[PDB]
Amino acid sequence: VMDYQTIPSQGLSGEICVPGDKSISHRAVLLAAIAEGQTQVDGFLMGADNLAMVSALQQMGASIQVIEDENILVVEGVGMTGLQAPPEALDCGNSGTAIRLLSGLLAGQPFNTVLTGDSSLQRRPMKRIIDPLTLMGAKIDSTGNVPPLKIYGNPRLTGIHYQLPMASAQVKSCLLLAGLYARGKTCITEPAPSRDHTERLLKHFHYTLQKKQSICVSGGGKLKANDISIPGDISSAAFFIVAATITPGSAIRLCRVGVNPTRLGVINLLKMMGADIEVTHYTEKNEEPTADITVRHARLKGIDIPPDQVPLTIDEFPVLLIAAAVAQGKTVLRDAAELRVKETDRIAAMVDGLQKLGIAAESLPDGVIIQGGTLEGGEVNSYDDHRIAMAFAVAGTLAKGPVRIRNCDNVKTSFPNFVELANEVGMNVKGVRGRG
Ligand SMILES: [K+]
Numbered sequence: 001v002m003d004y005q006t007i008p009s010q011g012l013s014g015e016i017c018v019p020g021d022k023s024i025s026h027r028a029v030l031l032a033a034i035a036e037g038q039t040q041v042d043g044f045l046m047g048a049d050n051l052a053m054v055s056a057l058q059q060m061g062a063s064i065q066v067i068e069d070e071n072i073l074v075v076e077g078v079g080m081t082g083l084q085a086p087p088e089a090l091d092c093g094n095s096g097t098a099i100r101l102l103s104g105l106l107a108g109q110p111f112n113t114v115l116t117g118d119s120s121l122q123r124r125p126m127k128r129i130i131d132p133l134t135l136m137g138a139k140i141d142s143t144g145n146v147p148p149l150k151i152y153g154n155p156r157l158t159g160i161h162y163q164l165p166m167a168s169a170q171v172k173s174c175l176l177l178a179g180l181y182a183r184g185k186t187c188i189t190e191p192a193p194s195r196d197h198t199e200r201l202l203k204h205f206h207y208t209l210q211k212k213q214s215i216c217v218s219g220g221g222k223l224k225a226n227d228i229s230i231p232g233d234i235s236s237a238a239f240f241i242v243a244a245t246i247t248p249g250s251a252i253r254l255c256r257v258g259v260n261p262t263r264l265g266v267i268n269l270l271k272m273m274g275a276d277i278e279v280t281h282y283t284e285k286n287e288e289p290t291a292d293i294t295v296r297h298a299r300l301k302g303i304d305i306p307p308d309q310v311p312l313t314i315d316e317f318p319v320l321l322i323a324a325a326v327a328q329g330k331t332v333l334r335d336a337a338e339l340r341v342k343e344t345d346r347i348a349a350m351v352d353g354l355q356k357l358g359i360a361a362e363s364l365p366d367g368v369i370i371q372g373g374t375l376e377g378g379e380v381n382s383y384d385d386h387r388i389a390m391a392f393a394v395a396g397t398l399a400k401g402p403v404r405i406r407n408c409d410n411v412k413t414s415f416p417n418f419v420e421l422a423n424e425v426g427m428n429v430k431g432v433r434g435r436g
Contacts, residue, residue, distance in 0.1 A: 001407060001409065001433070001434040001435065001436055002407075002408060002409055002431050002432065002433060002434050003404055003405055003406050003407065003408055003431070003432055003433075003434035004389065004392075004393050004396075004404070004405040004408045004411075004419070004429050004430070004431060004432075005402060005403075005404050005405075005429070005430045005431075005432050006393060006395075006396025006397070006399070006402060006403045006404075006405070006427075006428055006429050006430075007396070007402050007428045008396070008397060008398065008399060008400070008401075008428070009243070009247045009250075009396075009397040009398070009426055009427055009428055010249060010426065011247055011248060011249025011250045011251075011297070011426060012240070012243055012244045012247055012249075012250040012251075012252050012397070012425045012426045012427060013249075013250065013251055013252060013425060013426055014252060014253075014424065014425050014426070015252065015253040015254075015255055016240070016252070016253075016254060016255070016421050016424060016425055017232055017254070017255045017256050018232040018233055018236040018237045018240070018254060018257060018415075018421065019043075019045050019046070019047070019071070019232065019233060019236060019415060019416065019417060020043040020044055020045035020071060020230040020231070020232065020233060021043075021045065021197075021230055021231055021232065021233040021234070021235075021258050021288075022045050022047065022049060022050060022097070022233055022235070022236075022414050023097060023195065023197050023233075024197050024201070024230050024231070024258070024288060025041075025043075025044050025045040025050045025053075025230055026049075026050060026053050026095075026097050026098060026101060027101065027173065027197055027198055027201050028041050028044070028201060028228050028230060029041060029044065029050070029053060029054060029057065029064065029073055029075065030053065030057065030101055030102075030105060030177075031201055031202070031205050031223055032064075032073070032075035032077060032205075032225065032228070033057045033062035033063075033064065033075060033077060033078065033083075034062075034077060034078060034079065034080055034082065034083065034105075034223055035075075035077035035079070035205055035222075035223035035224060035225045035226075036077050036079050036222055036223065036224055036225060037077055037224060037225030038074065038075065038076050038077070038225050039073075039074075039075045039077065039225040039226060039227060039228065040072065040073070040074055040075075040227045040228075041072065041073040041074075041075065041227075041228050041230065042071065042072055042227075042228070042229045042230065043071055043229055043230030043231065043232075044071050044072065044073045044230055045071070045230070045233065045414070046066075046068050046071055046416060047412055047413055047414050047415065047416050048093055048094065048410075048412050048413045048416075049093060049094055049095035049097065049098060049413045049414060050095075051066070052091065052092055052093040052094075052095050052098055052117075053092075053095065053097075053098040053101075053102075054066060054073070055091070056086075056090040056091070056092060056098060056102060059086035059087070059088070059090060060083040060084055060085070060086045060113075061078060061082070061083055061084040062075070062078060062083070063075065063076035063077075063078060064076075075225075077223070077225050079222070080180070080181070080222060080223065081110075083109060084111075085111035085112070085113070086113060088114075089114035089115065089116045089148065090102065090113060090114065090115050090116070091116060091117060092115060092116065092117035092121055092147075093117050093118055093121070093413070094117065094118050094120060094121055094343065094386075094410060094413045095117065095121065095413070096121060096124045096169075096170070096342075096343075097170055098117075099115050099117060099121060099124070099126075099147055099149070100126070100129055100169075100170040100171075100173070100174050101170060101173060101174060101177060102115055103115060103126070103129055103133065103140070103149060103151060103174055104129070104133065104173065104174035104175060104176070104177030104178040105177045105178075106151045106153060107133045107136065107138035107140070107151060107153065107154065107157060107178045107181070108136075108138070108153065108154060108155060108157040108178055108180075108181030108182060108219075109153040109155065109181070110153055110155040111153045112150065112151060112152050112153055113150075113151045113153070114148055114149070114150050114151075115147060115148060115149045115150075115151065116147050116148035116149075117147055120343045120344065120384060120385075121147055122146055122147050122148065123146055124146060124147065124341065124342075124343075125145060125146065125341050126142060126145050126146055126147065126149060127145040128164075128166070128168075128169060128171050129170070129171055129174045129175075130142065130145060130149075132160065132162045132164070132171065132174075132175050133174070133175070133178055135160045135162065136157045136158055136159070136160050136175075136178055136182055136186070137154050137156065137157050137158050138151070138152075138154055138157065138178070139151070139152040139154060140152070155181070156183065157178060157181055157182040157183065157219070158182055158183055158184060159179060159182045159183065159184035159185045159186040159187075159218065159219060160175075160182075160186055160187075161186075161187045161189070162175060162186075162187070162188055162189070163188075163189045163190070164188065164189075164190055164191075165191075166191075167190060167191060167192050167193075167194045167311045168188075168190060168194050169338065171188075172188050172190065172194060172198065172215070173197070173198040175188050176188065176198050176199070176202065176215075176217055177198075179217040179218075179219055180207065180217060180219055180220075180221065180223075181219055181220075182219040183219055183220070184218060184219065185216050185217065185218040185219075186216065186217055186218070186219070187214050187215070187216040188214060188215055188216075189213060189214035189215075190213075190214070192308070192311055193262065194262060194311060195260070195262045195263065196260070196262055197260070197288075199215060200287040200288060201228075201287065202217070202223075203287065204226055204228060204286055204287045205223040205224055205225070205226055206222075206223070206224040206226065207221050207222075207223055208221060226286075227286075228286055228287070229285050229286060230288075231256060231257065231258030231259075231285075231288050231289075231290040232254070232255070232256050232257040232258055232290070233257075233258065233414070233415075234257050234258050234259065234260075234263050234264070234266070235263070235315050235316060235387075235414070236414065236415050237254045237257045237293060238266045238316045238319050238320075239319050239390050239391070239393070239394050239415075239418075240252060240254060240295070240421075240422075240425065240427070241254070241266065241267070241270065241275075241277065241293065241295050242266075242270070242319045242320065242322055242323050242394050243394045243397050243425075243427050244295035244296065244297065244425075245270060245275050245276070245277075245295060245296075245297065245298055245300070245323060246297070246300070246322070246323060246326050246394075246397065246398050247297060247397045247398055247427075248297050249297060250295070250296060250297040250426075251294075251295070251296045251297070252294070252295050252425055253292055253293070253294045253295075254292065254293040254294075254295070255281075255292050256290050256292070257290060257291060257292070257293050258288055258289070258290050259279060259282065259289050259290060259291045259293075260288060260289060262311075262312060263312070264312060265309050265310075265311075265312030265313025265314075265316060266313050266316035266319070266320055267279070267293075268309055268312065268313070269303070269305060269309055269313055269320060270300075270320070270323060272303050273300040273301055273302070273303055273323065273324075273327055274298055274299060274300050274301050275295075275298045275300065275323075276295065276296040276297070276298040277293065277294070277295050278293070278294045279291045279292070279293055279294075280292050280294065299328065300323055300324075300326065300327035300328065300372075301327055301328050301329050302324060302327045302328065302329035302330045302331040302332075302370070302371075302372050303331055303332075304331075304332045305331065305332065305333045305334065305367075307334060307335045310333075310334075310335045310336050314336065314338055314339070315387065317333065317336060317339060317346065317350075318346055318349075318350055318385075318387040318388055318390075318391035319387070319390065319391045319394055321333070321350050321354065321361075321368060321370060321391070322375075322391055322392075322394050322395045324370040324372060325354055325357075325359045325361070325370055325372065325373065325375060325395070326372060326373070326374070326375060326398055327372040328372050329371075329372050330369065330370065330371050330372065331368075331369070331370045331372070332367070332368075332369050332370075333364075333367035333368045333369075333370075334364065334366055334367045335366055335367065336366055336367045337365060337366040337367075339367075342385065342387075343383075343384065343385040343386070343387075343410075344383035344384060344385040344388065345383075346385065346387070346388065347363055347364075347367065347368055348363065349381075349382075349383045349385060349388045350368065350388065350391065351363045351368060352380070352381070353380035353381065353388065353391075353392055353395075354370070356378050356379065356380050357375050357376050357377075357378050357380065357392075357395060357399060357403065358373065358374060358375065358376035358378070359371070359373050359374075359375065360373060374400065375395055375398055375399040375400065375403075376399060376400050376401060377399050377400055377401020377402045377403055378399075378401070378403060378404070379403070379404040379405075379406065380392050380395075380403065380404070380405055380406070381405075381406045381407065382405055382406060382407045382408055382410070383407075384407055384409075384410050385410065386410045386411045386412075386413050386414050386415065387414075389405050389407070389408045389410065389411050390411060390415065390418060392405045393405060393408075393418075393422065393427070393429050394427070396427075396428070396429065397427055397428075406434055406435070407434060407436075408431065408434075419431055
């Protein structure tokens with residue numbers, strides 16, 4: 001078992017490219033697997049979650065060559081009906097995304113599948129997908145609406161018109177995938193817009209989409225192979241953006257980062273707090289916009305986080321709360337109860353760690369109240385959550401003393417080369433032997 005140990009930073013500098021987007025990587029390889037023809041995937045995130053998605057597809061006879069050192073996949077698609085019944089339960093590891101997407105993919109197959117994963121994954125809520133999939137005629141056994149899930153494939157799924165009562169957590173993507181195999185059209189309508197990585201990829205693979213506040217697909221179409229280049233993960237960049245923001249003497253450039261508007265919340269909010277962040281060299285390679293992000297040290301003020309930014313920033317709140325901890329004044333986060341049902345309860349985790357580092361932090365059922373202050377050295381627990389681990393690694397840049405973050409083995413689920421890149425820009429992090 002291993003921990004991260006930090007010492008304060010004298011300032012970040014240089015230019016780095018963060019690894020590929022986790023969310024786009026999952027969808028890219030899944031769609032490529034069932035496409036017709038050969039898809040080359042560049043920038044695939046070679047992390048534990050995305051490789052679990054790869055292994056899972058391979059158990060069902062996807063043809064995927066992994067070239068790990070180059071972040072490349074070469075996928076020979078097996079076509080829409082080309083998958084084969086896997087012999088054992090599919091282990092999604094730590095990956096909520098993989099299990100929810102596979103559920104959509106597998107609901108309409110002519111075979112049965114069991115989906116499971118690690119302890120954390122077996123606590124992630126699935127009611128949100130089970131219910132709509134069932135409306136389409138899926139049959140999914142589960143206890144307490146958490147994995148493991150047993151899917152009894154139904155090749156005669158029916159399109160539904162569904163209005164999700166919540167900015168989807170892969171619910172839209174899940175139903176869209178099921179929609180490809182359903183008879184008729186499947187229409188998903190949502191209160192507020194959410195991530196659209198799936199829609200962009202469906203278009204990329206030439207599957208017809210329509211189109212106003214809702215989105216529809218009709219089943220029985222074909223996915224057509226089309227090479228894809230995956231942008232840097234802005235959720236991964238977020239750690240360095242906060243680090244360069246709060247560490248005096250810092251100036252860095254993050255190259256080739258995805259800047260999808262539905263993912264830009266951390267930038268939007270930091271700027272509101274007074275951050276110094278410039279987006280340049282904006283380009284549009286296939287489907288996903290990417291840009292370079294230049295960050296310089298800046299003093300921050302606490303803010304009331306606007307409710308409309310919450311969906312745009314949900315995954316960056318761990319590291320954003322570090323910025324709040326060192327800002328001048330109070331920060332209030334509301335409407336973010338979804339933080340409690342992630343890999344760990346992220347509100348409880350962040351509040352626990354912040355208090356251990358000398359920050360006045362207070363939990364709400366749907367968020368947190370932070371009084372900006374001074375980070376001390378100390379020791380915190382990652383709660384096995386990659387973003388909690390990395391958030392406190394970022395805390396270490398400004399903490400008065402060393403920060404020990406226990407149990408960081410799961411950082412590689414989303415950011416395999418985190419330690420290397422951190423030390424490269426001047427964020428001091430070392431992996432050391434942990435306990436237990
Ligand atoms: K995960």
